[PDB]
Structures are given as structure tokens and as C-alpha cells.
Amino acid sequence: XISXXISXAKI
């Protein structure tokens, strides 16, 4: 399907 998101707090 669709996958992902948003990172950048820890990393």
C-alpha cells in the first residue's frame, strides 16, 4: 500500500 511518515525527533 502506502508507507512512510515523518522522522527527525530522535533521529
What residues make contact with a second copy under the rule CB under 8 A? 1-11
Give me the count of residues in the chain: 11
CA 9 – CA 2 distance, rounded (Å) = 22
- Quick one: DSSP state of residue 9? S
Least separation in angstroms between residue 6's CB and a second copy is 4
End-to-end CA distance of the chain: give it in Å, rounded.
25
Output the smallest distance, CB 11 to a second copy, in A.
Answer: 7
